[PDB]
Symmetry: C6
Subunit: 58 residues, 6 copies
């Protein structure tokens, strides 16, 4: 199926995002596109590039 | 054509060697074009293929 | 498809966290498929998206 | 879809990974993004993106 | 095929590579994935994926 | 359009500067979308473009 992806299923959910730089984000996913993921981390809004993510725990 | 070996890993116990040195002793629960779902102990993980060097199966 | 969240940043003051540890306090002046144009102080930079970890906005 | 990597199928090669490791390997399969190898007793799926170069 | 990098085709720019190296360069060519530069007396094909950003 | 300067390097002696810090004193024997084939001394290398930073030619 063209464009199928598991990351969409994380919308709305609270997850831990492990970045390639060692950072870990305690985040709530507010949006997912092909190449990006939108999250709230505390007071912060972040646009995270999927290419920068190693894995996500959910 | 547009074939990929990673799909055959669905259902299998593998060791995943990440680009940062970590190794996951995991069971593959799903595979898409860019991601691999695994259970590691009690932990549910979505792992991006770009962060994987190689997989031992 | 033809959607990206980065286009929403055009014209905004943001913090760009590069993959090299640098953090650019930037004004976004353009967004293309693979690049973001920013003014950092007096400098004009063309920043490749692949070099960006995330952006605070 | 032309690629040289396909021609390595069946060959003994040295795979230089992006972290510094090297693999003495027998190529058993090649897809668009992956190379399947046997390294001694081990079966590996190697992503091309993690490889720097290959000596054949 | 909209990209800003094409607009640099004749300009002197500073290219900041992913490994920390900096190039004082005059752009001579730009393709989808490459930028051709003269740095001093050297002729370089620089891959865009190796570039973090460019000051122009 | 599908244009890439690397095709011109076919046949030439060049210095390849890899993302890892290595330099290859190489003769280009073939070029595809994703790969460059080189002879470095008596050695035959398949070099992935993604692992190349730049090339002096």
């Amino acid at each position: 199926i063209p464009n199928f992806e598991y990351a969409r299923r994380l919308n709305g959910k609270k997850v831990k995002i492990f970045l390639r730089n060692g950072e870990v984000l305690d985040a709530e996913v507010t949006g997912v596109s092909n190449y990006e993921i939108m999250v709230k981390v505390g007071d912060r809004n972040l646009l995270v590039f999927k290419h920068a993510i190693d894995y996500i725990e959910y």
